[PDB]
Design a protein around this ligand. Structure first.
Ligand SMILES: NC(=O)c1ccc[n+]([C@@H]2O[C@H](COP(=O)([O-])OP(=O)(O)OC[C@H]3O[C@@H](n4cnc5c(N)ncnc54)[C@H](OP(=O)(O)O)[C@@H]3O)[C@@H](O)[C@H]2O)c1
Ligand SMILES: NC(=O)c1ccc[n+]([C@@H]2O[C@H](COP(=O)([O-])OP(=O)(O)OC[C@H]3O[C@@H](n4cnc5c(N)ncnc54)[C@H](OP(=O)(O)O)[C@@H]3O)[C@@H](O)[C@H]2O)c1
Ligand SMILES: O=C(O)c1cc(/C=C/c2ccc(O)c(C(=O)O)c2)ccc1O
Ligand SMILES: O=C(O)c1cc(/C=C/c2ccc(O)c(C(=O)O)c2)ccc1O
Lengths: 206, 206
């Protein structure tokens, strides 16, 4: 494995949990950053390394990024649609840590709304989308090998590995399962073909 | 009317650098106040006059404002997430220097959060937004000819010169390219129509 040690940010979240499970099964040595109050469930798969802290603390992000081959970012605000900078400021700390530690590959999830006409983004999601836009700018400007993953609705359908990946535009379906989205984040570790592109994974579950 | 000499504050910032370059290419005689001259580009368009100093030092500001026809303010304190008064104290120094040297025109950048409901502000941006509000009041109460430029997200898109400007309200998208924002800063030097108004520049970048 050319990529074997990875940091996952957001591993306790909807997509992070299945991404972690798939990564451990695939043989990755995974380091996670978890907030003190929200640890990984005791029954689930165990990462190799756990850092307890906050993506808003440069020190905690540095500890998580040190020694890795690549970074997966699945940060979010769960059900909370309020104005926030946690994703963009978290990305700022991640970029600084990758540069300091010689890590180049970052696969980071924002949203397909970054490929929408802004006048059609639902107003209830505008505040979160605003921080996705801020995040994407931070990562694009970093000069790192950045894969911008921009999914549409994240659903509960199965892992298929059969989804479409649309480059630099909206794809033909409006859903991706959380399991397939995690599968795609990990696929991006094994190829350079999506570096510098936006990617829209989607599938028809049938 | 004929503005030929301008001071730019914040010329080494994201918007400042392109405003400066555009001003020099268009023929303005530009004076900049910079804390570190190595943060100015060594190649291409270069300002006519460089004052090395700090906007918090009244004598440095006075030396920058002396002899100008108008002032552009693109100050910012990106890293401050808790109460901060750099921009508003800078604006007090600028206003005092403008009055002492007979400079009547100031075009200054705050943010579109000043046009929207306060709960739109992400918590980590509350402090900078409070100081934007303080700087806006300093400039409004000065009696100077003041164009308040209140942009949304500042993006990276190429200069278009085709953006929308809405007066005393919001408008189309929630993004303006730094290049288009700089272009609009300079357009405000050539007209009185925005004096005493708030302006919201935005555009759709396809
Ligand atoms: N739901 C959709 O249909 C959809 C569609 C497109 C895009 N998106 C975006 O896709 C991304 C992933 O969504 P998701 O549903 O998988 O994520 P999620 O369930 O909202 O999980 C968010 C993850 O980020 C962690 N996190 C939040 N703040 C943190 C902080 N300060 N420090 C460290 N970790 C922090 C959370 O940890 P905790 O356990 O401590 O909370 C959690 O692990 C999000 O950005 C979302 O906006 C979602
Ligand atoms: N999407 C956005 O980022 C956004 C959106 C809406 C509004 N705004 C606001 O737009 C304005 C311009 O934003 P920007 O991103 O273009 O600015 P920026 O890149 O953060 O640049 C800030 C400028 O102000 C200078 N500065 C800071 N403190 C100074 C001091 N004590 N003395 C002299 N100069 C000082 C900086 O000089 P140094 O190079 O020496 O640091 C730099 O030139 C800001 O006020 C910002 O809050 C930004
Ligand atoms: O909390 C949430 O629910 C949430 C939802 C989103 C939805 C993103 C999206 C983009 C493009 C799409 O086409 C569709 C669709 O079609 O369903 C959905 C983004 C961020 C979120 O935090
Ligand atoms: O530190 C920073 O980077 C910073 C960023 C800002 C951004 C303010 C703003 C206003 C209206 C907006 O719509 C949006 C958007 O859409 O992203 C953003 C302000 C002050 C800052 O110091």
């Amino acid at each position: 494995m050319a990529v074997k040690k990875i940091a996952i940010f957001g591993a306790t979240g909807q997509t992070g949990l299945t991404t972690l499970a798939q990564a451990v099964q695939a043989g990755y040595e995974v380091t996670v950053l978890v907030r003190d109050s929200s640890r990984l469930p005791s029954e689930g798969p165990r990462p190799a390394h756990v850092v307890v802290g906050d993506v808003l603390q440069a020190a905690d992000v540095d500890k998580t990024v040190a020694g890795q081959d690549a970074v997966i970012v699945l940060l979010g605000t769960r059900n909370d649609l309020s104005p926030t900078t946690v994703m963009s400021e978290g990305a700022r700390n991640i970029v600084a840590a990758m540069k300091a530690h010689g890590v180049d590959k970052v696969v980071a999830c924002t949203s397909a709304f970054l490929l929408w006409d802004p006048t059609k983004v639902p107003p209830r999601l505008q505040a979160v989308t605003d921080d996705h836009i801020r995040m994407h700018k931070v990562l694009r400007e970093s000069g790192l090998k950045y894969v911008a993953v921009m999914p549409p609705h994240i659903g509960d359908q199965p892992l298929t590995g059969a989804y479409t990946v649309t480059l630099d535009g909206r794809g033909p379906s409006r859903v991706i399962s959380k399991h397939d989205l995690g599968h795609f984040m990990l696929r991006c570790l094994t190829t350079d073909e999506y570096d510098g592109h936006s990617t829209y994974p989607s599938h028809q579950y049938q």
